[PDB]
Scaffold this active site. Structure first.
Site, mmCIF file in Angstrom:
data_model
loop_
_atom_site.group_PDB
_atom_site.id
_atom_site.type_symbol
_atom_site.label_atom_id
_atom_site.label_comp_id
_atom_site.label_asym_id
_atom_site.label_seq_id
_atom_site.Cartn_x
_atom_site.Cartn_y
_atom_site.Cartn_z
ATOM 1 N N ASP A 111 -6.916 -60.604 -32.006
ATOM 2 C CA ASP A 111 -7.019 -59.591 -30.975
ATOM 3 C C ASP A 111 -5.567 -59.371 -30.533
ATOM 4 O O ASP A 111 -4.963 -60.214 -29.850
ATOM 5 C CB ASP A 111 -7.929 -60.083 -29.845
ATOM 6 C CG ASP A 111 -8.240 -59.019 -28.811
ATOM 7 O OD1 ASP A 111 -7.622 -57.956 -28.808
ATOM 8 O OD2 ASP A 111 -9.058 -59.313 -27.908
ATOM 9 N N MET A 112 -5.021 -58.266 -31.047
ATOM 10 C CA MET A 112 -3.639 -57.869 -30.875
ATOM 11 C C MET A 112 -3.527 -56.384 -30.508
ATOM 12 O O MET A 112 -2.457 -55.978 -30.092
ATOM 13 C CB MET A 112 -2.843 -58.159 -32.174
ATOM 14 C CG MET A 112 -1.273 -58.098 -32.054
ATOM 15 S SD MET A 112 -0.434 -58.691 -33.557
ATOM 16 C CE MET A 112 1.239 -58.358 -33.094
ATOM 17 N N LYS A 113 -4.585 -55.562 -30.691
ATOM 18 C CA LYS A 113 -4.464 -54.118 -30.279
ATOM 19 C C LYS A 113 -3.197 -53.461 -30.839
ATOM 20 O O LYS A 113 -2.432 -52.761 -30.154
ATOM 21 C CB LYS A 113 -4.525 -54.041 -28.737
ATOM 22 C CG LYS A 113 -5.875 -54.724 -28.232
ATOM 23 C CD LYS A 113 -5.936 -54.841 -26.782
ATOM 24 C CE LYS A 113 -7.341 -55.268 -26.363
ATOM 25 N NZ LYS A 113 -7.574 -56.700 -26.443
ATOM 26 N N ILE A 114 -2.969 -53.688 -32.124
ATOM 27 C CA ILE A 114 -1.757 -53.228 -32.787
ATOM 28 C C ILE A 114 -1.809 -51.704 -32.795
ATOM 29 O O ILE A 114 -2.897 -51.123 -32.805
ATOM 30 C CB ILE A 114 -1.646 -53.787 -34.216
ATOM 31 C CG1 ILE A 114 -2.907 -53.375 -35.040
ATOM 32 C CG2 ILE A 114 -1.450 -55.339 -34.183
ATOM 33 C CD1 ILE A 114 -2.865 -53.784 -36.482
ATOM 34 N N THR A 171 -7.967 -56.427 -33.920
ATOM 35 C CA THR A 171 -8.200 -55.265 -33.049
ATOM 36 C C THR A 171 -7.082 -54.276 -33.163
ATOM 37 O O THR A 171 -5.914 -54.637 -33.293
ATOM 38 C CB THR A 171 -8.395 -55.683 -31.577
ATOM 39 O OG1 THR A 171 -7.226 -56.358 -31.073
ATOM 40 C CG2 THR A 171 -9.597 -56.650 -31.460
#
Ligand SMILES: COc1ccc(C(=O)CCC(=O)O)c(O)c1
Ligand SMILES: COc1ccc(C(=O)CCC(=O)O)c(O)c1
Lengths: 318, 318
Positions: free
Chosen positions: A136-139, A163
């Site tokens: 979960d990094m929302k790159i 993510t």
């Protein structure tokens, strides 16, 4: 092989869709170190005996040493050792209840490189226990650039998914979910509705034709997965929808049957776990991952807490 | 101090708004190493003479190790050596021409912790040079989680600013641009208009009250800059606006005078610099940053490429 195959055959093995978050903060580490020091290194000893601890790659020479690392010189290396052992401790105490583990990148980066070494070992550890993983990094970035995140996430951590934030454009997902020079493909969860209290402001007050932004974005994401050959290649693009957004959960599940969902918000947000958010979903229930992190990881008995949720989940699944 | 004031001071001292991008890929590091392993470590020998490399905090001993390799001990550290030395060389060759350096986090993570050491050393070296810094990382998450970015970026790297993706919300900025327990204020640039081909799907086609997404987003960002009390504290929330977004650049400089804008897209993307970019959105010009990355760092002669761009930007500032 592919993640779709890894989720089904795993949920077959363990029969839930609990997803355990592993987001250790400075206090979680400082506190596990204290307890371990005042209990003759108890859980570390446990850790140090687990079978697959040898399968990690960063600083085995320090990690797998027995704790005469206090001040048998090796001062500088204390934080590394307990950060990593704490992660091992939670995985060991809870993996029998977890379909997947979700590690949030931000918890591993703020001390610099040492936490990236921990994040690497934690991902090796999960890989070898052949347990499904999410970063979960929302790159998000441009394509030449975002391929760096793909190298990081799927080649180096060898993660099974991540993510992504698609506000810059649905196209970025081409250099995230596919490598040509490798001819490999990978899975992802795009942000649809998040659990922050002001999340409505953009995913809702914004629209294209009386449709809210989250639908458009959801619709966009899933048309990009169809555009790539991922379903076919046993990978997916799925959705992050927060546990507190019930209406939206019922929207996505009906107007997007068969999609994979990843749902944060139960526990330290709570709200209603057993609302139209876990229920309304079913067959191949790997398609609705209920993330719980701190309700397990900050619980004095993480094993207990994991079973508590594994059973609640395994009750409402009916 | 505070970022605005740092921006003003350097802007008088050097008369530009050129922002130099430091994004080193794998071809860059290997090529740097071969040329040096050929031209007798010419540029590295020059790094070794620079005042501030004696101040770097990670692996000074390695980094300062005899110009050559003399084919001794380290092969373990060769990639670290040539990565960090490539970054120091670019900075050394280009710094007199840069208002700011922007580093893209993506390029420093895909090798695990080794490049976070490099990036740390790069921010330390920039900090010691007192040169304005941006971490382009496009961070985003929920409040409890995002404080970890703020820690990494503002305390650990001592960056002056970062790029933020506000799509989730505006509330996240309370935990990025503000640190209550130290009572510190930090600056950021939010994504408004980005340079990727398909950047319009959400940025332009989403709306509220006939206003496009990027207008509400930019407005709301500025509403939080006022809520947080950041101006009073010599800090800001500003805007990323792609160089090729001519019309919108014009629009935001029109409807938000005094705003701080970061503009990437020149060099390794097309088209040019005058073409409306710098004049669309002129001001007191630390407020219009023109980022130029690859066209400097992938050029045989970076100091000369720098100078040439610096000449162009100054010319255009009438
Ligand atoms: C896996 O990491 C997590 C992330 C979030 C939570 C919450 O329940 C809080 C969510 C909110 O308050 O918005 C958690 O327990 C673990
Ligand atoms: C920050 O330094 C950079 C890094 C990369 C590029 C590109 O390759 C194209 C950018 C785009 O397509 O927006 C650049 O022009 C400058």
């Amino acid at each position: 092989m592919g993640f779709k195959v890894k989720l089904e055959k795993r949920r077959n093995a363990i029969n839930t869709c609990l997803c355990i978050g592993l987001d250790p903060d400075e206090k979680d580490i400082e506190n596990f170190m204290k307890n371990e020091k005042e209990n003759n290194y108890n859980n570390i000893k446990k850790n140090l005996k687990e079978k697959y601890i040898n399968n990690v790659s960063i600083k085995k020479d320090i990690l797998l040493k027995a704790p005469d690392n206090i001040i048998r010189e090796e001062k500088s290396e204390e934080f590394f050792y307990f950060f990593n052992h704490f992660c091992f401790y939670i995985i060991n105490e809870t993996n029998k209840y977890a379909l997947t583990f979700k590690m949030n990148f931000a918890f591993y980066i703020p001390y610099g490189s040492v936490g990236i070494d921990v994040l690497k070992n934690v991902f090796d550890y999960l890989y070898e226990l052949n347990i499904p993983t999410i970063l979960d990094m929302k790159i998000n970035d441009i394509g030449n650039t975002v391929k760096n995140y793909r190298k990081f996430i799927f080649e180096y951590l060898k993660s099974d998914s991540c993510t992504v934030n698609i506000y810059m454009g649905t196209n970025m997902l081409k250099d995230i979910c596919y490598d040509e020079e490798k001819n490999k493909y990978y899975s992802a969860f795009v942000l649809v509705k998040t659990t922050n209290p002001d999340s409505a402001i953009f995913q809702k007050n914004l629209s294209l034709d009386n449709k809210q932004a989250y639908v458009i974005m959801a619709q966009e994401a899933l048309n990009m997965s169809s555009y790539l050959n991922l379903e076919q290649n046993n990978e997916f693009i799925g959705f992050v929808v927060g546990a507190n957004s019930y209406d939206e959960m019922n929207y996505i599940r009906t107007y997007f049957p068969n999609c994979y969902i990843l749902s944060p918000g139960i526990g330290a947000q709570n709200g209603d776990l057993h609302k139209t958010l876990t229920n309304g979903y079913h067959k191949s229930y790997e398609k609705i991952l209920i993330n719980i992190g701190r309700a397990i990881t900050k619980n004095p008995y993480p094993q207990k807490a994991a079973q508590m949720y594994y059973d609640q989940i395994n009750a409402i699944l009916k």
